[PDB]
């Protein structure tokens, strides 16, 4: 700028750390999506040989979603939430880069490995669940909702000082007026019936879905693909697993914007032999297990009757043998492949 002081400008330009000078990342892309571009990176000087994740934020400048992600990550500190190490602001192209510690694994790949094996885990499942609840409880206590919880966003650290530690990532930081309206497998039924705002209870439903999938290796509410919140086939799958809710189970279902549509399309009789008990029996989980009774409390249809993250953390399941461990792999060797480059 002409009206900016020149000495001030050149001093800052001389001192400013550029992402391309500090890190080696070309050809090392490991992710690509609506979030942006994620790279596996090494430090160019030989101070430490650790792996780092570099996220180039989607778009240019500082959008409302970019502003809020920086704002909140700058404050949040907890072992089970991914930690922002540094921000690079690239003046030439107006791009924003975020530096995090590198997580070798995630629940999407871990679950796919077990699902692929067609031809430790019980201690691992509990420990994963406990750390996901701990992480989300920390965000919730700070009035920060995730708003997009699923196995792809539950990272797990590989070999290093934080071996087998869960890291929650890719929080939905920007949603206009906190609104859902502006593959549906992890979405709470109230969202599908047109709920106008995200809640803590919506995150908890997603954790219930993740927990079912960890126990069975299959997405509990799996459904075919395909603006409006109402999605017929996703609701049908929910009722096929859960049963259709009685008036007493969800009294305020009448207040949901899409309730009359539900009544128009669905009949109670269709799901009269469907229940979570029967579904989980077919996938070798016992209904009198402490694991199951907790799952049912997490997967409660009416959001006000859904258990909170803190109450789920106090569940006797986590006092039953085996106890949860800081390393979810529990000292055992990691059989899961390292993630490949793009």
């Amino acid at each position: 700028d002409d009206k900016m002081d020149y000495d001030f400008k050149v001093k800052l330009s001389s001192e400013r750390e550029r992402v391309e000078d500090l890190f080696e990342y070309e050809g090392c892309k490991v992710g690509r999506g609506t979030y942006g571009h994620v790279y596996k990176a090494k430090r160019k000087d030989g101070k430490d040989d650790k792996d780092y994740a570099l996220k180039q934020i989607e778009g240019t400048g500082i959008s409302m979603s970019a502003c809020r992600e920086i704002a909140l990550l700058r404050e949040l500190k907890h072992p089970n939430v991914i930690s922002l190490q540094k921000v690079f602001l690239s003046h030439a192209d107006r791009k924003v880069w975020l530096l995090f510690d590198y997580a070798e694994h995630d629940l999407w790949h871990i679950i796919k490995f077990h699902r692929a094996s067609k031809a430790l885990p019980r201690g691992m499942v509990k420990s994963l669940l406990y750390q996901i609840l701990d992480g989300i409880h920390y965000l919730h206590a700070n009035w920060v909702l995730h708003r997009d919880l699923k196995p792809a966003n539950i990272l797990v650290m590989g070999e290093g000082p934080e071996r087998g530690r869960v890291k929650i990532a890719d929080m939905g930081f920007a949603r206009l007026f906190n609104s859902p309206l502006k593959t549906f497998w992890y979405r709470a039924p109230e969202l599908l019936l047109g709920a106008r705002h995200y809640t803590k209870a919506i995150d908890i439903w997603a954790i219930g879905c993740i927990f079912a999938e960890l126990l069975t290796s299959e997405p509990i509410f799996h459904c075919r693909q395909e603006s409006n919140p109402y999605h017929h086939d996703q609701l049908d799958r929910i009722f096929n697993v859960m049963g259709f809710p009685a008036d007493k189970d969800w009294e305020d279902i009448k207040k949901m914007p899409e309730h009359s549509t539900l009544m128009k399309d669905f009949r109670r009789n269709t799901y009269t032999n469907c229940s979570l008990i029967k579904y989980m029996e077919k996938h070798k989980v016992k209904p009198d297990s402490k694991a199951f009774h907790l799952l049912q409390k997490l997967l409660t249809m009416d959001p006000i009757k859904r258990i909170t993250s803190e109450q789920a953390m106090q569940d006797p399941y986590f006092l039953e043998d085996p106890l949860p461990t800081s390393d979810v792999f529990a000292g055992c060797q990691i059989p899961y492949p390292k993630r490949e480059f793009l």
């Binding site: 500082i62 920086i70 107006r94």
Partner: peptide, 16 residues
């Protein structure tokens, strides 16, 4: 937009 980049840098990205 240019001034915004200098502001965010100076503040060490501290926005809350």
């Amino acid at each position: 937009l240019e001034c915004e980049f200098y502001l965010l840098e100076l503040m060490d990205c501290c926005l809350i």
